Design a protein around this ligand. Structure first.
Ligand SMILES: [Ca+2]
Ligand SMILES: [Cl-]
Ligand SMILES: [Cl-]
Length: 379
């Protein structure tokens, strides 16, 4: 045995080379000894019975490295804004590494739901997939998808912004010779960029006039094109169906959804989350955007939130964790701070086994502690 605890001082001592050394923590001792040792309680007596050297180890290291994990690796990042009905709204970021309790009051965004969000002056709209760049001032766009003028975008965190994958602008695709006469044989009314309609089995189908033909557009896209430029058309003129059957049908790639979009009320649903989970059984991970009244955890789990020394998030753990990121390894202590574990042997010396896959998009947000290395724990 080369690891001792003075029953009075509770200070850890580790025999190396040939003499005793005071060591900061159990982590640093197992690092220098090379094995996940356990301390042997000794009275103050036998300490003095042998020479002493300088203090050794890592001060910023956790005392030990316990782990309480799945089964399943689940990591969820959430943004909560209080005073959402102000000027002046304040964002609270939370990192959750425990089982999630998802319900109707906090679940993934529906296809027809979206959250208006502002980051670094610009605004972004968040869907089920991720975020889209959207022109806040574009009233012809926003009123076309039925975005309320009362609807205020709410600040998002750097963490949540980086977590949410970009899905492209939003924003209409441009039309070159918009205003110029059409080269399709259509009436002079329908210059390119203009919209007409044809009544079908399902009622009106809308078409925008393009340089190389016509293109089916949804009502949201149709109402948008007219809103930005109506070309003197009060309403999309009715065209008899047979008149267009021999006009080349093209593709106008508008991101605007067929559905009217419910823009969630931040006072009602203050929680915006990016959840990540892998079953630890082959396959790929699954991620989605959550929206609702509160964090997707049990009410009593709120007592486990620890605000870091100087980090950006409040962490929620049901125990220490050991993970593998994009492949770099980090141990997470019960206080939610990450420590780099350089290699497998170093991990084995800590008694750490089997890293679970975790997303860097969330683990990054933890306070990065000192690297737990063999060379470091020697001083
Ligand atoms: Ca919902
Ligand atoms: Cl987990
Ligand atoms: Cl896994």
């Amino acid at each position: 045995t080369s690891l001792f605890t003075d029953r009075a001082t509770n200070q850890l001592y580790v025999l190396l080379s040939g003499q005793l050394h005071p060591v900061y923590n159990l982590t640093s001792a197992r690092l220098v000894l090379g094995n996940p040792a356990n301390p042997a309680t000794v009275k103050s007596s036998e300490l003095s019975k042998l020479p002493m050297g300088q203090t050794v180890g890592i001060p910023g290291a956790p005392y030990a490295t316990p782990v309480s994990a799945g089964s399943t690796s689940i990591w969820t990042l959430c943004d909560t804004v209080a005073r959402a009905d102000s000027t002046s709204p304040v964002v609270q970021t939370a990192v959750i590494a425990m089982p999630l309790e998802i319900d109707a009051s906090i679940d993934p965004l529906q296809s027809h739901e979206a959250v208006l969000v502002s980051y670094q002056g610009e605004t972004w709209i968040v869907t089920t997939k991720g975020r889209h760049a959207i022109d806040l001032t574009d009233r012809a766009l926003t009123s076309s998808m039925g975005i309320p003028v009362t609807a205020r975008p709410t600040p998002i965190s750097e963490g949540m912004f980086n977590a949410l994958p970009d899905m492209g602008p939003w924003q209409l695709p441009p039309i070159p010779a918009a205003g110029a006469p059409n080269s399709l044989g259509l009436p002079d009314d329908l210059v390119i960029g203009s919209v007409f309609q044809i009544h079908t089995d399902k009622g009106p189908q809308y078409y925008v006039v393009l340089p190389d033909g016509i293109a089916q557009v949804n009502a949201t896209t149709a109402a948008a094109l007219r809103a930005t430029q109506a070309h003197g058309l009060v309403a999309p003129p009715a065209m008899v169906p047979s008149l267009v059957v021999r006009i080349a049908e093209r593709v106008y790639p508008s991101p605007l959804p067929d559905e009217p979009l419910k823009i969630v009320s931040r006072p009602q649903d203050p929680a915006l989350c990016w959840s990540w989970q892998r079953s630890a059984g082959d396959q790929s991970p699954q991620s989605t955007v959550l929206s609702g009244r509160h964090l997707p955890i049990s009410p009593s789990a709120m007592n486990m939130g620890i605000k870091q020394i100087h980090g950006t998030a409040t962490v929620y753990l049901d125990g220490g964790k050991f993970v593998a990121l994009q492949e770099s390894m980090y141990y997470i202590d019960p206080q939610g701070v990450r420590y780099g574990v350089p290699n497998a042997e170093t991990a084995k010396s800590l008694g750490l086994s089997s890293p679970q896959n975790a997303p860097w998009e969330i683990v990054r947000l933890l306070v990065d502690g000192p690297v737990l290395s063999k060379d470091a724990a020697l001083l």
